[PDB]
Design a protein around this ligand. Structure first.
Ligand SMILES: O=C(O)c1ccc(Cl)cc1NS(=O)(=O)c1ccc(Br)s1
Length: 559
């Protein structure tokens, strides 16, 4: 069937849409070429619509069926729990889109009478009505990027807040536990960046002659078929479930997940969806299971030897045993034709790689640096272009989510996050005297409230003390960073070092947690290094839950 059907009504914005980076003294000190930074808007929606609208092709074979059964066998060991209304409410983000039924996220979290009562009625409706398609709103996603030598906005589809709370009750536990049970070490969201690097490195070194490749599916969500979504449900159904959860899952599958009507911000009928909606609770888990199922089966059909996969939603990376240059190239081609038959055609053509550091998965690549002892240490990095552009945007405009904070946490060991992001934002927080202000950021799609002053402990727990001592980065990594800066008009690293020295001194003079940030975060800035010992508060933070599962588009808030 067609992934989408359109009536002609336009995808409209619910407010003014900013697309240009403001000329601000704070953002200008970080990035001067402001005209190179832009934010996607509804103005390019039609372009996106064109790319994601097509008739899907899907042929399932014995390999697919074999792998599916293997997966259901593992799903069968799972017992999922129904979340209470209260628990589901507490998982709703403070700034989540309000319901059209007279209440918002605030009311949901405070368990207000109107919100709870409506949520109960929506739940009872899921138990009673197994067929009526649930309404969804379609919006053009607002994302920031750097112009290329531009990207159309992504389309986000989500149901009303009441429905979202119900999804949590019936499926939060399932999407939080089932993926790991089914895919084991292949489920990427169970790993912190350091553990992900560890897994990739060990897997790579565990092969006699390793060969790896990233596989980019062309607009994955639109390739997900009704069959795929019902197969996904068949896996969920293997869990032990409360009767009402089993029905809610059955109802949500047919009324929402497999497709439904699309309504714009103006309340007009935009068309119909018959593929994956980006904004429902099962999207991350569903895409991961679907991608893993198809790829595992495709690997068998292609005859790839000793395959080890790592999947994060629609992002896939495979490491296997090389069978020779020409043999690998032909096998990868076969793999792609098998994925294509499974309705997961390639976006960027896949290519075999024989150097782990040259593989990009989850927009990241493995690289090497050295610790104080001089020992080699692997860590996760990426091209800093998007992170810097977004840091500049969030510097000039207020944003609910701070990608810069999430980037510092996730890429704390990198040359760019340390010299630029930390320096830039700590200097601003110092000037505005807001170091003790907790800020929101997302990790694997879930929203977290984090205090900047706790970054030293956080970083130590997730990355280890080496994150504060890495040096002698690879020439390739240094060049990528340096060239990126010249491109964006970001001051050269020498300028950042000078600014860092001043930020460090200021932080130390304040003492307390502030001084700790100066000592650990900026020890790289001084020649007379200080002794960095394990932070007492570090080995005490409850980071359990940070890297358990993916929740992108899931409307999840962890507190
Ligand atoms: O050690 C490096 O690879 C390196 C790369 C770029 C620059 Cl500007 C300085 C470098 N040497 S350095 O100042 O000791 C340093 C170590 C860690 C950081 Br972050 S900066």
């Amino acid at each position: 069937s067609m992934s989408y059907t359109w009536t002609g009504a336009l995808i409209t914005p619910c407010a003014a849409e900013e697309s240009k980076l403001p000329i601000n003294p704070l953002s200008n000190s970080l990035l001067r070429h402001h005209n190179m930074v832009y934010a996607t808007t509804s103005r390019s929606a039609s372009l996106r619509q064109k790319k994601v609208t097509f008739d899907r092709l899907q042929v399932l074979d014995d390999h697919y069926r074999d792998v599916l059964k293997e997966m259901k066998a593992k799903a069968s060991t799972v017992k999922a729990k129904l979340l209470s209304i209260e628990e589901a409410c507490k998982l709703t983000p403070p700034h989540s889109a309000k319901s059209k039924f007279g209440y918002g996220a605030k009311d949901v979290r405070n368990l207000s009478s109107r919100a709870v009562n409506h949520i109960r009625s929506v739940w009872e409706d899921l138990l009673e009505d197994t067929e009526t398609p649930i309404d969804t709103t379609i919006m053009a996603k607002s994302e920031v990027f750097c112009v290329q030598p531009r990207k159309p906005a992504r389309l986000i589809v989500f149901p009303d807040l009441g429905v979202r709370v119900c999804e949590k009750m019936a499926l939060y536990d399932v999407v939080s536990t089932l993926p790991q049970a089914v895919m084991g070490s292949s489920y990427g969201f169970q790993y912190s960046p350091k553990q992900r690097v560890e897994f990739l490195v060990n897997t790579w070194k565990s092969k006699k002659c390793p060969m790896g490749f990233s596989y980019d599916t062309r607009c994955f969500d639109s390739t997900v078929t009704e069959s795929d979504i019902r197969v996904e449900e068949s896996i969920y159904q293997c869990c032990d479930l409360a009767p009402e959860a089993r029905q809610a899952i059955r109802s949500l599958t047919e009324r929402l997940y497999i497709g439904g009507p699309l309504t714009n911000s103006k309340g007009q009928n935009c068309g119909y969806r018959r593929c994956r909606a980006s904004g429902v609770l099962t999207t991350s888990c569903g895409n991961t299971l679907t991608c893993y199922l198809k790829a595992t089966a495709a690997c068998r059909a292609a005859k790839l030897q000793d395959c080890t996969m790592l999947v994060n939603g629609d992002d896939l990376v495979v490491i296997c045993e090389s069978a020779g240059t020409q043999e690998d190239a032909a096998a990868l081609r076969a793999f792609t034709e098998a994925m294509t038959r499974y309705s997961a055609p390639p976006g960027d053509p896949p290519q075999p790689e024989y150097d782990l550091e040259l593989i990009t998965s989850c927009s990241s690549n493995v690289s090497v640096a050295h610790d104080a002892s001089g020992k080699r240490v692997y860590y996760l990095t990426r091209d800093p272009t998007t992170p810097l552009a977004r840091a500049a945007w969030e510097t000039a405009r207020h944003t609910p989510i701070n990608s810069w904070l999430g980037n510092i946490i996730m890429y704390a060991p990198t040359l760019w996050a340390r010299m630029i992001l930390m320096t830039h934002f700590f200097s601003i927080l110092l000037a505005q005297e807001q170091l003790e202000k907790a800020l929101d950021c997302q990790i694997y799609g879930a929203c977290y409230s984090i205090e900047p002053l706790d970054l030293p402990q956080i970083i130590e727990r997730l990355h280890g003390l080496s994150a504060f001592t890495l040096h002698s980065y690879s020439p390739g990594e240094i060049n990528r960073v340096a060239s990126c800066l010249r491109k964006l008009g970001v001051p050269p690293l020498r300028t950042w070092r000078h600014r860092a020295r001043s930020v460090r001194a200021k932080l130390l003079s304040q003492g307390g947690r502030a001084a700790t940030c100066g000592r650990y975060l900026f020890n790289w800035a001084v020649r007379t290094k200080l002794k960095l010992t394990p932070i007492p508060a570090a080995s005490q933070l409850d980071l359990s839950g940070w890297f358990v599962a993916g929740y992108s588009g899931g409307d999840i808030y962890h507190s």
